[PDB]
Amino acid sequence: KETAAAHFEHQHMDSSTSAASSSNYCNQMMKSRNLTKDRCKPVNTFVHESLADVQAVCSQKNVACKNGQTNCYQSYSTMSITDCRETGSSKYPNCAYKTTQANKHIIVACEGNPYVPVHFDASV
Amino acid sequence: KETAAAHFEHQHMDSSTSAASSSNYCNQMMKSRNLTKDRCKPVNTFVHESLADVQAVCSQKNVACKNGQTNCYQSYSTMSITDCRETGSSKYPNCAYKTTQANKHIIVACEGNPYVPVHFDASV
Amino acid sequence: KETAAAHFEHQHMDSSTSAASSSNYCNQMMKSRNLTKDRCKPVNTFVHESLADVQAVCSQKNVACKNGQTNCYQSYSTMSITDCRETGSSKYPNCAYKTTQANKHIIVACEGNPYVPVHFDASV
Amino acid sequence: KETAAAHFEHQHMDSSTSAASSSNYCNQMMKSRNLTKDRCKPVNTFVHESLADVQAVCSQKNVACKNGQTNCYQSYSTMSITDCRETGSSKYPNCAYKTTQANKHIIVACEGNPYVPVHFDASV
Ligand SMILES: Nc1ccn([C@@H]2O[C@H](CO)[C@@H](OP(=O)(O)O)[C@H]2O)c(=O)n1
Ligand SMILES: Nc1ccn([C@@H]2O[C@H](CO)[C@@H](OP(=O)(O)O)[C@H]2O)c(=O)n1
Ligand SMILES: Nc1ccn([C@@H]2O[C@H](CO)[C@@H](OP(=O)(O)O)[C@H]2O)c(=O)n1
Ligand SMILES: Nc1ccn([C@@H]2O[C@H](CO)[C@@H](OP(=O)(O)O)[C@H]2O)c(=O)n1
């Protein structure tokens, strides 16, 4: 409760579903994964692919992370992701999000043994 | 001194090209705009639109900034951008950048009178 | 059904009054113009100005439409309008609408030949 | 011109030697295989294995291609390869290469019927 890798799948993995359907998505999932219990998390990406496909990004294109660290990797291919961006109104506790489905490259930080994602840097 | 407004333009505006001409665009631009002076800026986005069109984003879709502030705005339209991301092997002061040209919505933070971009939040 | 231009006239023009005469202006209008016959249209603005005046906006300030298209135009001058949202006290067909009277710049999408309004985007 | 698989054979197979026999293997081979005709091809890998062994990789571990396509495959076993890279002082028409010999898993793109290597993607 809980490893960095577990924390990553907690915040960023949702393989239950293939894409985004209704704009209640982030609204509902941000609440579910305990992302709106203290403050409306401003931005959070969910990845709709197998855990294996996301984990494999750790052996693909090496790139610098946003903080300047160099343990980040961009997926070679597009992935099904849902970008969750808190709306301009939106007040805690009633957190509201603009749900946005897309097919972007993802960029994740990787570390440890096994060599897996531990943070979601960006989609591109 | 420098106005945040002008600082934004310097770091993120490239109205002269409609797109990135080559895969060397970023390497060129990151140095010419002096963003690799003290450190390799890991991420920097350039916008290939008029200053008017970019400034106009300030009256478009209001959203939360990455830091949670509420003065951010997402363009209604996609815009021509170039994402510059530092390579994994890049080492200051010899900074190197992957280039990704794309049509994407931009998210800028706005403030002041006139009410204009002063930070580049994200592209989606 | 209707041409695009005609549809705009029927839904948004009201040159027969200086303003909403009552807190239930929307409700006699949302009916009179068949906006509440198959539903309760959530939002609908009535412009208490000249059709020509409104059509002229198609040659004023070009601005990005909310949907990302770029054929939108903002009036230079303010216009008398009525904003129709519906009161909580409203389930179809017994429709009740929250009315509001104001002088705002309007934003319309225009197209065709002649270049005329086909959609009402926002009042600012 | 040659067919995909044949191009691959002509570019990447050297089943006649077990390893680069000297520091100048690449210089002679890049010449020999006509890889310096119009330009100094910046990097090229020669595999010191039988052809069928390399083709068999098309049925081994499926991985993402650097271009992001999904038809790439990583070899279960390490293979004898020679890495050839332009040496810096290399200048067309006088190309010059650094020869590096190693045991690595190759990654190749495969396509067609029969499913055969048509592009060499990386050595890992
Ligand atoms: N594109 C983005 C940008 C930020 N984020 C989230 O917001 C945080 C960045 O401030 C990240 O925390 P981790 O990097 O700890 O996952 C990530 O959860 C995201 O999920 N997608
Ligand atoms: N998508 C992104 C992420 C970061 N950045 C740049 O990275 C910096 C740190 O996040 C930002 O500084 P400003 O937002 O102050 O311009 C912005 O310049 C960007 O330009 N595009
Ligand atoms: N300020 C606003 C915002 C929306 N609307 C209505 O909202 C509807 C959908 O956004 C529009 O229908 P048209 O697109 O047919 O004009 C428009 O009639 C309005 O009439 N005034
Ligand atoms: N390790 C690598 C990486 C790239 N390459 C070569 O680099 C070229 C383009 O990256 C490829 O040409 P083909 O697509 O003709 O194989 C491939 O031959 C290589 O031969 N070994």
mmCIF file with all atom_site columns, all heavy atoms in Angstrom, chain D residues 7-8 11-12 41-46 66 83-85 104 118-123, ligand 4:
data_model
loop_
_atom_site.group_PDB
_atom_site.id
_atom_site.type_symbol
_atom_site.label_atom_id
_atom_site.label_alt_id
_atom_site.label_comp_id
_atom_site.label_asym_id
_atom_site.label_entity_id
_atom_site.label_seq_id
_atom_site.pdbx_PDB_ins_code
_atom_site.Cartn_x
_atom_site.Cartn_y
_atom_site.Cartn_z
_atom_site.occupancy
_atom_site.B_iso_or_equiv
_atom_site.pdbx_formal_charge
_atom_site.auth_seq_id
_atom_site.auth_comp_id
_atom_site.auth_asym_id
_atom_site.auth_atom_id
_atom_site.pdbx_PDB_model_num
ATOM   1   N N   . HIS D 1 7   ? 16.121 -6.906  -50.538 1.00 0.00 ? 7   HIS D N   1
ATOM   2   C CA  . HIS D 1 7   ? 16.829 -5.704  -50.118 1.00 0.00 ? 7   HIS D CA  1
ATOM   3   C C   . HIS D 1 7   ? 17.381 -5.926  -48.733 1.00 0.00 ? 7   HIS D C   1
ATOM   4   O O   . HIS D 1 7   ? 18.475 -5.475  -48.393 1.00 0.00 ? 7   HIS D O   1
ATOM   5   C CB  . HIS D 1 7   ? 15.881 -4.508  -50.132 1.00 0.00 ? 7   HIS D CB  1
ATOM   6   C CG  . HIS D 1 7   ? 16.538 -3.200  -49.837 1.00 0.00 ? 7   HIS D CG  1
ATOM   7   N ND1 . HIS D 1 7   ? 17.372 -2.565  -50.732 1.00 0.00 ? 7   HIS D ND1 1
ATOM   8   C CD2 . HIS D 1 7   ? 16.463 -2.391  -48.755 1.00 0.00 ? 7   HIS D CD2 1
ATOM   9   C CE1 . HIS D 1 7   ? 17.786 -1.424  -50.211 1.00 0.00 ? 7   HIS D CE1 1
ATOM   10  N NE2 . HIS D 1 7   ? 17.250 -1.294  -49.010 1.00 0.00 ? 7   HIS D NE2 1
ATOM   11  N N   . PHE D 1 8   ? 16.604 -6.641  -47.931 1.00 0.00 ? 8   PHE D N   1
ATOM   12  C CA  . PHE D 1 8   ? 16.989 -6.885  -46.562 1.00 0.00 ? 8   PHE D CA  1
ATOM   13  C C   . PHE D 1 8   ? 18.193 -7.795  -46.583 1.00 0.00 ? 8   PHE D C   1
ATOM   14  O O   . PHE D 1 8   ? 19.176 -7.546  -45.902 1.00 0.00 ? 8   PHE D O   1
ATOM   15  C CB  . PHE D 1 8   ? 15.842 -7.503  -45.757 1.00 0.00 ? 8   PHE D CB  1
ATOM   16  C CG  . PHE D 1 8   ? 16.234 -7.886  -44.369 1.00 0.00 ? 8   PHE D CG  1
ATOM   17  C CD1 . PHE D 1 8   ? 16.178 -6.958  -43.344 1.00 0.00 ? 8   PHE D CD1 1
ATOM   18  C CD2 . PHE D 1 8   ? 16.704 -9.163  -44.091 1.00 0.00 ? 8   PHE D CD2 1
ATOM   19  C CE1 . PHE D 1 8   ? 16.576 -7.307  -42.069 1.00 0.00 ? 8   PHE D CE1 1
ATOM   20  C CE2 . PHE D 1 8   ? 17.091 -9.520  -42.805 1.00 0.00 ? 8   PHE D CE2 1
ATOM   21  C CZ  . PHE D 1 8   ? 17.030 -8.584  -41.799 1.00 0.00 ? 8   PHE D CZ  1
ATOM   22  N N   . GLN D 1 11  ? 21.254 -6.084  -47.738 1.00 0.00 ? 11  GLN D N   1
ATOM   23  C CA  . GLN D 1 11  ? 21.726 -5.052  -46.822 1.00 0.00 ? 11  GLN D CA  1
ATOM   24  C C   . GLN D 1 11  ? 22.236 -5.569  -45.482 1.00 0.00 ? 11  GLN D C   1
ATOM   25  O O   . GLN D 1 11  ? 23.138 -4.960  -44.893 1.00 0.00 ? 11  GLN D O   1
ATOM   26  C CB  . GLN D 1 11  ? 20.612 -4.028  -46.546 1.00 0.00 ? 11  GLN D CB  1
ATOM   27  C CG  . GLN D 1 11  ? 20.471 -2.883  -47.542 1.00 0.00 ? 11  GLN D CG  1
ATOM   28  C CD  . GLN D 1 11  ? 19.510 -1.799  -47.033 1.00 0.00 ? 11  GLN D CD  1
ATOM   29  O OE1 . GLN D 1 11  ? 19.684 -0.607  -47.315 1.00 0.00 ? 11  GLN D OE1 1
ATOM   30  N NE2 . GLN D 1 11  ? 18.492 -2.215  -46.273 1.00 0.00 ? 11  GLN D NE2 1
ATOM   31  N N   . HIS D 1 12  ? 21.648 -6.653  -44.977 1.00 0.00 ? 12  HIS D N   1
ATOM   32  C CA  . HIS D 1 12  ? 21.872 -7.061  -43.574 1.00 0.00 ? 12  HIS D CA  1
ATOM   33  C C   . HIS D 1 12  ? 22.419 -8.464  -43.312 1.00 0.00 ? 12  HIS D C   1
ATOM   34  O O   . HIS D 1 12  ? 22.822 -8.767  -42.192 1.00 0.00 ? 12  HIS D O   1
ATOM   35  C CB  . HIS D 1 12  ? 20.573 -6.887  -42.801 1.00 0.00 ? 12  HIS D CB  1
ATOM   36  C CG  . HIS D 1 12  ? 20.104 -5.479  -42.793 1.00 0.00 ? 12  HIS D CG  1
ATOM   37  N ND1 . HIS D 1 12  ? 20.774 -4.481  -42.105 1.00 0.00 ? 12  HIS D ND1 1
ATOM   38  C CD2 . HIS D 1 12  ? 19.099 -4.861  -43.456 1.00 0.00 ? 12  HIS D CD2 1
ATOM   39  C CE1 . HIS D 1 12  ? 20.179 -3.331  -42.320 1.00 0.00 ? 12  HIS D CE1 1
ATOM   40  N NE2 . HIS D 1 12  ? 19.155 -3.532  -43.135 1.00 0.00 ? 12  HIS D NE2 1
ATOM   41  N N   . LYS D 1 41  ? 25.488 5.850   -46.064 1.00 0.00 ? 41  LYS D N   1
ATOM   42  C CA  . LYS D 1 41  ? 24.419 5.368   -45.200 1.00 0.00 ? 41  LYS D CA  1
ATOM   43  C C   . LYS D 1 41  ? 24.950 5.403   -43.792 1.00 0.00 ? 41  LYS D C   1
ATOM   44  O O   . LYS D 1 41  ? 25.984 4.805   -43.511 1.00 0.00 ? 41  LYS D O   1
ATOM   45  C CB  . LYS D 1 41  ? 23.981 3.960   -45.577 1.00 0.00 ? 41  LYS D CB  1
ATOM   46  C CG  . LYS D 1 41  ? 22.823 3.470   -44.745 1.00 0.00 ? 41  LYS D CG  1
ATOM   47  C CD  . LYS D 1 41  ? 22.473 2.026   -45.067 1.00 0.00 ? 41  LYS D CD  1
ATOM   48  C CE  . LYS D 1 41  ? 21.031 1.719   -44.702 1.00 0.00 ? 41  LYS D CE  1
ATOM   49  N NZ  . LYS D 1 41  ? 20.663 0.296   -45.008 1.00 0.00 ? 41  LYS D NZ  1
ATOM   50  N N   . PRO D 1 42  ? 24.283 6.154   -42.915 1.00 0.00 ? 42  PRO D N   1
ATOM   51  C CA  . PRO D 1 42  ? 24.853 6.461   -41.593 1.00 0.00 ? 42  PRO D CA  1
ATOM   52  C C   . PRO D 1 42  ? 25.027 5.263   -40.658 1.00 0.00 ? 42  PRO D C   1
ATOM   53  O O   . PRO D 1 42  ? 26.035 5.210   -39.951 1.00 0.00 ? 42  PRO D O   1
ATOM   54  C CB  . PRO D 1 42  ? 23.852 7.463   -41.010 1.00 0.00 ? 42  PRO D CB  1
ATOM   55  C CG  . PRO D 1 42  ? 22.599 7.275   -41.776 1.00 0.00 ? 42  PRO D CG  1
ATOM   56  C CD  . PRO D 1 42  ? 22.995 6.834   -43.148 1.00 0.00 ? 42  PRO D CD  1
ATOM   57  N N   . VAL D 1 43  ? 24.079 4.333   -40.617 1.00 0.00 ? 43  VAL D N   1
ATOM   58  C CA  . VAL D 1 43  ? 24.261 3.124   -39.805 1.00 0.00 ? 43  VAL D CA  1
ATOM   59  C C   . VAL D 1 43  ? 23.735 1.879   -40.526 1.00 0.00 ? 43  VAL D C   1
ATOM   60  O O   . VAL D 1 43  ? 22.682 1.897   -41.156 1.00 0.00 ? 43  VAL D O   1
ATOM   61  C CB  . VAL D 1 43  ? 23.570 3.225   -38.397 1.00 0.00 ? 43  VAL D CB  1
ATOM   62  C CG1 . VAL D 1 43  ? 23.768 4.590   -37.781 1.00 0.00 ? 43  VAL D CG1 1
ATOM   63  C CG2 . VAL D 1 43  ? 22.087 2.898   -38.453 1.00 0.00 ? 43  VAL D CG2 1
ATOM   64  N N   . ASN D 1 44  ? 24.475 0.780   -40.451 1.00 0.00 ? 44  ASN D N   1
ATOM   65  C CA  . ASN D 1 44  ? 23.950 -0.457  -41.019 1.00 0.00 ? 44  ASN D CA  1
ATOM   66  C C   . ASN D 1 44  ? 24.456 -1.687  -40.314 1.00 0.00 ? 44  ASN D C   1
ATOM   67  O O   . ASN D 1 44  ? 25.655 -1.826  -40.056 1.00 0.00 ? 44  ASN D O   1
ATOM   68  C CB  . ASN D 1 44  ? 24.276 -0.555  -42.506 1.00 0.00 ? 44  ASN D CB  1
ATOM   69  C CG  . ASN D 1 44  ? 23.484 -1.644  -43.198 1.00 0.00 ? 44  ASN D CG  1
ATOM   70  O OD1 . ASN D 1 44  ? 22.286 -1.495  -43.438 1.00 0.00 ? 44  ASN D OD1 1
ATOM   71  N ND2 . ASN D 1 44  ? 24.154 -2.735  -43.546 1.00 0.00 ? 44  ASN D ND2 1
ATOM   72  N N   . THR D 1 45  ? 23.532 -2.587  -40.019 1.00 0.00 ? 45  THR D N   1
ATOM   73  C CA  . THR D 1 45  ? 23.863 -3.802  -39.288 1.00 0.00 ? 45  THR D CA  1
ATOM   74  C C   . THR D 1 45  ? 23.973 -5.022  -40.182 1.00 0.00 ? 45  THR D C   1
ATOM   75  O O   . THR D 1 45  ? 23.070 -5.303  -40.968 1.00 0.00 ? 45  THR D O   1
ATOM   76  C CB  . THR D 1 45  ? 22.808 -4.101  -38.218 1.00 0.00 ? 45  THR D CB  1
ATOM   77  O OG1 . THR D 1 45  ? 22.762 -3.005  -37.295 1.00 0.00 ? 45  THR D OG1 1
ATOM   78  C CG2 . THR D 1 45  ? 23.157 -5.396  -37.479 1.00 0.00 ? 45  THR D CG2 1
ATOM   79  N N   . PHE D 1 46  ? 25.074 -5.752  -40.034 1.00 0.00 ? 46  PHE D N   1
ATOM   80  C CA  . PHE D 1 46  ? 25.250 -7.042  -40.697 1.00 0.00 ? 46  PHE D CA  1
ATOM   81  C C   . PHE D 1 46  ? 25.097 -8.205  -39.721 1.00 0.00 ? 46  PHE D C   1
ATOM   82  O O   . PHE D 1 46  ? 25.738 -8.252  -38.674 1.00 0.00 ? 46  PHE D O   1
ATOM   83  C CB  . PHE D 1 46  ? 26.624 -7.104  -41.367 1.00 0.00 ? 46  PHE D CB  1
ATOM   84  C CG  . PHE D 1 46  ? 26.777 -6.150  -42.503 1.00 0.00 ? 46  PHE D CG  1
ATOM   85  C CD1 . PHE D 1 46  ? 27.587 -5.029  -42.383 1.00 0.00 ? 46  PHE D CD1 1
ATOM   86  C CD2 . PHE D 1 46  ? 26.119 -6.366  -43.702 1.00 0.00 ? 46  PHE D CD2 1
ATOM   87  C CE1 . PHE D 1 46  ? 27.750 -4.142  -43.444 1.00 0.00 ? 46  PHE D CE1 1
ATOM   88  C CE2 . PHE D 1 46  ? 26.272 -5.473  -44.768 1.00 0.00 ? 46  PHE D CE2 1
ATOM   89  C CZ  . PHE D 1 46  ? 27.093 -4.368  -44.633 1.00 0.00 ? 46  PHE D CZ  1
ATOM   90  N N   . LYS D 1 66  ? 10.120 1.034   -34.202 1.00 0.00 ? 66  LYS D N   1
ATOM   91  C CA  . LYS D 1 66  ? 10.443 2.406   -33.875 1.00 0.00 ? 66  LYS D CA  1
ATOM   92  C C   . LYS D 1 66  ? 9.511  3.404   -34.578 1.00 0.00 ? 66  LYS D C   1
ATOM   93  O O   . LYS D 1 66  ? 9.205  4.458   -34.022 1.00 0.00 ? 66  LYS D O   1
ATOM   94  C CB  . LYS D 1 66  ? 11.904 2.704   -34.214 1.00 0.00 ? 66  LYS D CB  1
ATOM   95  C CG  . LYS D 1 66  ? 12.884 2.019   -33.273 1.00 0.00 ? 66  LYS D CG  1
ATOM   96  C CD  . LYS D 1 66  ? 14.305 2.416   -33.591 1.00 0.00 ? 66  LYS D CD  1
ATOM   97  C CE  . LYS D 1 66  ? 15.288 1.784   -32.624 1.00 0.00 ? 66  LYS D CE  1
ATOM   98  N NZ  . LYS D 1 66  ? 16.676 1.879   -33.158 1.00 0.00 ? 66  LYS D NZ  1
ATOM   99  N N   . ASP D 1 83  ? 27.971 -3.965  -35.999 1.00 0.00 ? 83  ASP D N   1
ATOM   100 C CA  . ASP D 1 83  ? 27.400 -2.627  -36.072 1.00 0.00 ? 83  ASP D CA  1
ATOM   101 C C   . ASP D 1 83  ? 28.346 -1.728  -36.886 1.00 0.00 ? 83  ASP D C   1
ATOM   102 O O   . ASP D 1 83  ? 29.546 -1.682  -36.633 1.00 0.00 ? 83  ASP D O   1
ATOM   103 C CB  . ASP D 1 83  ? 27.155 -2.096  -34.656 1.00 0.00 ? 83  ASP D CB  1
ATOM   104 C CG  . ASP D 1 83  ? 26.604 -0.686  -34.638 1.00 0.00 ? 83  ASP D CG  1
ATOM   105 O OD1 . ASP D 1 83  ? 25.366 -0.520  -34.726 1.00 0.00 ? 83  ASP D OD1 1
ATOM   106 O OD2 . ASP D 1 83  ? 27.417 0.258   -34.519 1.00 0.00 ? 83  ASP D OD2 1
ATOM   107 N N   . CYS D 1 84  ? 27.823 -1.078  -37.917 1.00 0.00 ? 84  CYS D N   1
ATOM   108 C CA  . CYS D 1 84  ? 28.638 -0.169  -38.729 1.00 0.00 ? 84  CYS D CA  1
ATOM   109 C C   . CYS D 1 84  ? 28.092 1.247   -38.645 1.00 0.00 ? 84  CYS D C   1
ATOM   110 O O   . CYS D 1 84  ? 26.931 1.497   -38.998 1.00 0.00 ? 84  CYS D O   1
ATOM   111 C CB  . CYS D 1 84  ? 28.677 -0.596  -40.197 1.00 0.00 ? 84  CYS D CB  1
ATOM   112 S SG  . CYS D 1 84  ? 29.229 -2.264  -40.585 1.00 0.00 ? 84  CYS D SG  1
ATOM   113 N N   . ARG D 1 85  ? 28.930 2.178   -38.202 1.00 0.00 ? 85  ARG D N   1
ATOM   114 C CA  . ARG D 1 85  ? 28.497 3.555   -38.023 1.00 0.00 ? 85  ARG D CA  1
ATOM   115 C C   . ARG D 1 85  ? 29.490 4.528   -38.618 1.00 0.00 ? 85  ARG D C   1
ATOM   116 O O   . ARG D 1 85  ? 30.699 4.358   -38.455 1.00 0.00 ? 85  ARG D O   1
ATOM   117 C CB  . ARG D 1 85  ? 28.312 3.878   -36.545 1.00 0.00 ? 85  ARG D CB  1
ATOM   118 C CG  . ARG D 1 85  ? 27.280 3.042   -35.881 1.00 0.00 ? 85  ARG D CG  1
ATOM   119 C CD  . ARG D 1 85  ? 26.704 3.750   -34.683 1.00 0.00 ? 85  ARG D CD  1
ATOM   120 N NE  . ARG D 1 85  ? 25.276 3.485   -34.642 1.00 0.00 ? 85  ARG D NE  1
ATOM   121 C CZ  . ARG D 1 85  ? 24.720 2.546   -33.897 1.00 0.00 ? 85  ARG D CZ  1
ATOM   122 N NH1 . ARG D 1 85  ? 25.478 1.824   -33.091 1.00 0.00 ? 85  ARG D NH1 1
ATOM   123 N NH2 . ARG D 1 85  ? 23.413 2.351   -33.941 1.00 0.00 ? 85  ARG D NH2 1
ATOM   124 N N   . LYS D 1 104 ? 23.990 -9.689  -29.869 1.00 0.00 ? 104 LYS D N   1
ATOM   125 C CA  . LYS D 1 104 ? 22.788 -8.977  -29.449 1.00 0.00 ? 104 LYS D CA  1
ATOM   126 C C   . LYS D 1 104 ? 21.542 -9.590  -30.056 1.00 0.00 ? 104 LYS D C   1
ATOM   127 O O   . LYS D 1 104 ? 21.596 -10.261 -31.074 1.00 0.00 ? 104 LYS D O   1
ATOM   128 C CB  . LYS D 1 104 ? 22.879 -7.492  -29.830 1.00 0.00 ? 104 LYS D CB  1
ATOM   129 C CG  . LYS D 1 104 ? 23.901 -6.689  -29.023 1.00 0.00 ? 104 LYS D CG  1
ATOM   130 C CD  . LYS D 1 104 ? 24.336 -5.410  -29.750 1.00 0.00 ? 104 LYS D CD  1
ATOM   131 C CE  . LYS D 1 104 ? 23.420 -4.205  -29.447 1.00 0.00 ? 104 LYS D CE  1
ATOM   132 N NZ  . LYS D 1 104 ? 23.857 -2.934  -30.138 1.00 0.00 ? 104 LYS D NZ  1
ATOM   133 N N   . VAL D 1 118 ? 11.897 -7.518  -43.686 1.00 0.00 ? 118 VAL D N   1
ATOM   134 C CA  . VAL D 1 118 ? 12.049 -6.518  -44.745 1.00 0.00 ? 118 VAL D CA  1
ATOM   135 C C   . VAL D 1 118 ? 12.726 -5.246  -44.266 1.00 0.00 ? 118 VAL D C   1
ATOM   136 O O   . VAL D 1 118 ? 12.988 -4.356  -45.066 1.00 0.00 ? 118 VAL D O   1
ATOM   137 C CB  . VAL D 1 118 ? 10.680 -6.116  -45.366 1.00 0.00 ? 118 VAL D CB  1
ATOM   138 C CG1 . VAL D 1 118 ? 9.960  -7.348  -45.870 1.00 0.00 ? 118 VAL D CG1 1
ATOM   139 C CG2 . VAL D 1 118 ? 9.823  -5.362  -44.363 1.00 0.00 ? 118 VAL D CG2 1
ATOM   140 N N   . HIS D 1 119 ? 12.965 -5.131  -42.963 1.00 0.00 ? 119 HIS D N   1
ATOM   141 C CA  . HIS D 1 119 ? 13.614 -3.944  -42.425 1.00 0.00 ? 119 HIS D CA  1
ATOM   142 C C   . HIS D 1 119 ? 14.298 -4.313  -41.113 1.00 0.00 ? 119 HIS D C   1
ATOM   143 O O   . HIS D 1 119 ? 13.783 -5.113  -40.336 1.00 0.00 ? 119 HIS D O   1
ATOM   144 C CB  . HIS D 1 119 ? 12.601 -2.786  -42.249 1.00 0.00 ? 119 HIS D CB  1
ATOM   145 C CG  . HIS D 1 119 ? 13.030 -1.723  -41.274 1.00 0.00 ? 119 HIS D CG  1
ATOM   146 N ND1 . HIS D 1 119 ? 13.797 -0.635  -41.638 1.00 0.00 ? 119 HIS D ND1 1
ATOM   147 C CD2 . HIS D 1 119 ? 12.783 -1.578  -39.945 1.00 0.00 ? 119 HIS D CD2 1
ATOM   148 C CE1 . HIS D 1 119 ? 14.011 0.128   -40.578 1.00 0.00 ? 119 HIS D CE1 1
ATOM   149 N NE2 . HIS D 1 119 ? 13.413 -0.430  -39.534 1.00 0.00 ? 119 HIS D NE2 1
ATOM   150 N N   . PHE D 1 120 ? 15.485 -3.769  -40.895 1.00 0.00 ? 120 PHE D N   1
ATOM   151 C CA  . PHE D 1 120 ? 16.211 -4.005  -39.655 1.00 0.00 ? 120 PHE D CA  1
ATOM   152 C C   . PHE D 1 120 ? 15.987 -2.798  -38.755 1.00 0.00 ? 120 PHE D C   1
ATOM   153 O O   . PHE D 1 120 ? 16.247 -1.664  -39.142 1.00 0.00 ? 120 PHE D O   1
ATOM   154 C CB  . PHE D 1 120 ? 17.686 -4.244  -39.935 1.00 0.00 ? 120 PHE D CB  1
ATOM   155 C CG  . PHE D 1 120 ? 18.485 -4.676  -38.722 1.00 0.00 ? 120 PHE D CG  1
ATOM   156 C CD1 . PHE D 1 120 ? 18.798 -6.021  -38.518 1.00 0.00 ? 120 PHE D CD1 1
ATOM   157 C CD2 . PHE D 1 120 ? 18.949 -3.736  -37.807 1.00 0.00 ? 120 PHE D CD2 1
ATOM   158 C CE1 . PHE D 1 120 ? 19.530 -6.428  -37.406 1.00 0.00 ? 120 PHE D CE1 1
ATOM   159 C CE2 . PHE D 1 120 ? 19.691 -4.135  -36.699 1.00 0.00 ? 120 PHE D CE2 1
ATOM   160 C CZ  . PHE D 1 120 ? 19.978 -5.491  -36.494 1.00 0.00 ? 120 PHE D CZ  1
ATOM   161 N N   . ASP D 1 121 ? 15.490 -3.032  -37.555 1.00 0.00 ? 121 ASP D N   1
ATOM   162 C CA  . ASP D 1 121 ? 15.017 -1.919  -36.739 1.00 0.00 ? 121 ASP D CA  1
ATOM   163 C C   . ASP D 1 121 ? 15.988 -1.508  -35.639 1.00 0.00 ? 121 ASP D C   1
ATOM   164 O O   . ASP D 1 121 ? 16.148 -0.316  -35.393 1.00 0.00 ? 121 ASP D O   1
ATOM   165 C CB  . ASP D 1 121 ? 13.660 -2.262  -36.120 1.00 0.00 ? 121 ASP D CB  1
ATOM   166 C CG  . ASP D 1 121 ? 12.818 -1.028  -35.870 1.00 0.00 ? 121 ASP D CG  1
ATOM   167 O OD1 . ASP D 1 121 ? 12.888 -0.070  -36.677 1.00 0.00 ? 121 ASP D OD1 1
ATOM   168 O OD2 . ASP D 1 121 ? 12.114 -1.014  -34.850 1.00 0.00 ? 121 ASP D OD2 1
ATOM   169 N N   . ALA D 1 122 ? 16.611 -2.491  -34.977 1.00 0.00 ? 122 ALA D N   1
ATOM   170 C CA  . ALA D 1 122 ? 17.521 -2.232  -33.847 1.00 0.00 ? 122 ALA D CA  1
ATOM   171 C C   . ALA D 1 122 ? 18.205 -3.492  -33.366 1.00 0.00 ? 122 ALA D C   1
ATOM   172 O O   . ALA D 1 122 ? 17.736 -4.603  -33.610 1.00 0.00 ? 122 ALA D O   1
ATOM   173 C CB  . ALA D 1 122 ? 16.766 -1.578  -32.658 1.00 0.00 ? 122 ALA D CB  1
ATOM   174 N N   . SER D 1 123 ? 19.309 -3.309  -32.658 1.00 0.00 ? 123 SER D N   1
ATOM   175 C CA  . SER D 1 123 ? 19.925 -4.397  -31.927 1.00 0.00 ? 123 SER D CA  1
ATOM   176 C C   . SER D 1 123 ? 19.902 -4.085  -30.440 1.00 0.00 ? 123 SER D C   1
ATOM   177 O O   . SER D 1 123 ? 20.274 -2.999  -30.022 1.00 0.00 ? 123 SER D O   1
ATOM   178 C CB  . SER D 1 123 ? 21.346 -4.648  -32.426 1.00 0.00 ? 123 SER D CB  1
ATOM   179 O OG  . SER D 1 123 ? 22.149 -3.486  -32.369 1.00 0.00 ? 123 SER D OG  1
HETATM 180 N N1  . LIG E 2 .   ? 20.655 -0.845  -35.348 1.00 0.00 ? 4   LIG E N1  1
HETATM 181 C C1  . LIG E 2 .   ? 20.293 -0.375  -36.616 1.00 0.00 ? 4   LIG E C1  1
HETATM 182 C C2  . LIG E 2 .   ? 19.414 0.762   -36.743 1.00 0.00 ? 4   LIG E C2  1
HETATM 183 C C3  . LIG E 2 .   ? 19.106 1.159   -38.030 1.00 0.00 ? 4   LIG E C3  1
HETATM 184 N N2  . LIG E 2 .   ? 19.611 0.477   -39.082 1.00 0.00 ? 4   LIG E N2  1
HETATM 185 C C4  . LIG E 2 .   ? 19.358 0.910   -40.474 1.00 0.00 ? 4   LIG E C4  1
HETATM 186 O O1  . LIG E 2 .   ? 18.922 2.256   -40.439 1.00 0.00 ? 4   LIG E O1  1
HETATM 187 C C5  . LIG E 2 .   ? 18.104 2.443   -41.590 1.00 0.00 ? 4   LIG E C5  1
HETATM 188 C C6  . LIG E 2 .   ? 17.018 3.412   -41.278 1.00 0.00 ? 4   LIG E C6  1
HETATM 189 O O2  . LIG E 2 .   ? 17.027 3.570   -39.888 1.00 0.00 ? 4   LIG E O2  1
HETATM 190 C C7  . LIG E 2 .   ? 17.473 1.055   -41.926 1.00 0.00 ? 4   LIG E C7  1
HETATM 191 O O3  . LIG E 2 .   ? 17.540 0.860   -43.250 1.00 0.00 ? 4   LIG E O3  1
HETATM 192 P P1  . LIG E 2 .   ? 16.211 -0.369  -43.835 1.00 0.00 ? 4   LIG E P1  1
HETATM 193 O O4  . LIG E 2 .   ? 14.913 0.302   -43.394 1.00 0.00 ? 4   LIG E O4  1
HETATM 194 O O5  . LIG E 2 .   ? 16.605 -0.351  -45.298 1.00 0.00 ? 4   LIG E O5  1
HETATM 195 O O6  . LIG E 2 .   ? 16.751 -1.551  -43.018 1.00 0.00 ? 4   LIG E O6  1
HETATM 196 C C8  . LIG E 2 .   ? 18.372 0.004   -41.181 1.00 0.00 ? 4   LIG E C8  1
HETATM 197 O O7  . LIG E 2 .   ? 19.121 -0.664  -42.139 1.00 0.00 ? 4   LIG E O7  1
HETATM 198 C C9  . LIG E 2 .   ? 20.524 -0.659  -38.898 1.00 0.00 ? 4   LIG E C9  1
HETATM 199 O O8  . LIG E 2 .   ? 20.978 -1.240  -39.854 1.00 0.00 ? 4   LIG E O8  1
HETATM 200 N N3  . LIG E 2 .   ? 20.825 -1.065  -37.620 1.00 0.00 ? 4   LIG E N3  1
#
